[PDB]
């Protein structure tokens, strides 16, 4: 009789395609602190306000 | 002082007015601010709040 030999049908593995999608990449955006300056006097005042006759 | 960082022939990087970190209270004649034994001061800011 003649031997099969068996060279196989399956080629490589999914693992390369699996690794392709497995890509995670970079996520999220900068927020919160930004720059922050601010300056004006809407908080408190100062002006002569007494009483007399 | 109002100073200016300049590259090259006349390529001005920036013009910076001295902030409150860079204030000198006294500059008597024939003197340095700061004194010669001490190290010179650092200017690294652009904004009035130096942020």
UniProtKB/Swiss-Prot annotation, chain A:
Inducing stimuli: Positively transcriptionally regulated by AtxA, which, in turn, is induced by bicarbonate and high temperatures (37 degrees Celsius).
Location in the cell: Secreted; Host cytoplasm, Host cytosol
The family this protein is said to belong to: Belongs to the peptidase M34 family.
Domain notes: Lethal factor (LF) is composed of four domains: domain I contains the first ATLF domain that binds the membrane-translocating component protective antigen (PA); domains II, III and IV together create a long deep groove that holds the 16-residue N-terminal tail of MAPKK before cleavage. Domain IV contains the catalytic center.
Subunit structure: Interacts (via ATLF domain 1) with the cleaved form of protective antigen (PA-63) anthrax toxin; interaction is required for LF translocation into the host cytoplasm. Interacts with PA-63 homooligomers (either homoheptamers or homooctamers): three molecules of LF bind the PA-63 homoheptamer to form the PA(7)LF(3) complex, in which the relative position of the N-terminal alpha-helices in the three LFs determines which factor is translocated first.
Role played: Lethal factor (LF), which constitutes one of the three proteins composing the anthrax toxin, is able to trigger rapid cell death in macrophages. Acts as a protease that cleaves the N-terminal of most dual specificity mitogen-activated protein kinase kinases (MAPKKs or MAP2Ks) (except for MAP2K5): cleavage invariably occurs within the N-terminal proline-rich region preceding the kinase domain, thus disrupting a sequence involved in directing specific protein-protein interactions necessary for the assembly of signaling complexes.
Protein name: Lethal factor
Organism of derivation: Bacillus anthracis
Gene name tied to this protein: lef
Parent-protein residues present: 87 to 139 of 809
From Swiss-Prot, chain B:
Upper lineage: Bacteria, Bacillati, Bacillota, Bacilli, Bacillales
Effect caused by changing residue 49 to C: Abolished ability for mediate LF and EF protein translocation
UniProt superkingdom: Bacteria
Site (Phi-clamp): 49
Annotated localization: Host cell membrane; Host endosome membrane
Subunit structure: Homooligomer; homooligomerizes to form homoheptamers (PA-63(7)) or homooctamers (PA-63(8)). PA-63(7) or PA-63(8) form ring-shaped oligomers that are in a pre-pore conformation, which do not penetrate the host membrane. PA-63(8) displays an enhanced stability, suggesting that this form circulates in the blood to reach and exert toxicity even in distant tissues. Interacts with lethal factor (LF) and edema factor (EF); can bind LF and EF simultaneously and interaction takes place following homooligomerization on the host cell membrane.
Topology of this chain in the membrane: Multi-pass membrane protein
Domain note: Phe-49 residue forms the phi-clamp in the pore and catalyzes protein translocation via a charge-state-dependent Brownian ratchet. To pass through this hydrophobic restriction, substrate proteins LF and EF need to be unfolded prior to translocation.
Protein known as: Protective antigen PA-63
Role this protein plays: Mature form that oligomerizes and forms a pore to translocate the enzymatic toxin components edema factor (EF) and lethal factor (LF) into the host cytosol. Following attachment to host cell receptors and cleavage by FURIN, homooligomerizes to form ring-shaped oligomers that are in a pre-pore conformation, and associates with EF and LF. Toxin-leaded complexes are then endocytosed in a clathrin-dependent process, followed by a conformational change of oligomerized PA-63 from the pre-pore to pore state, which is triggered by the low pH in the endosome.
Organism: Bacillus anthracis
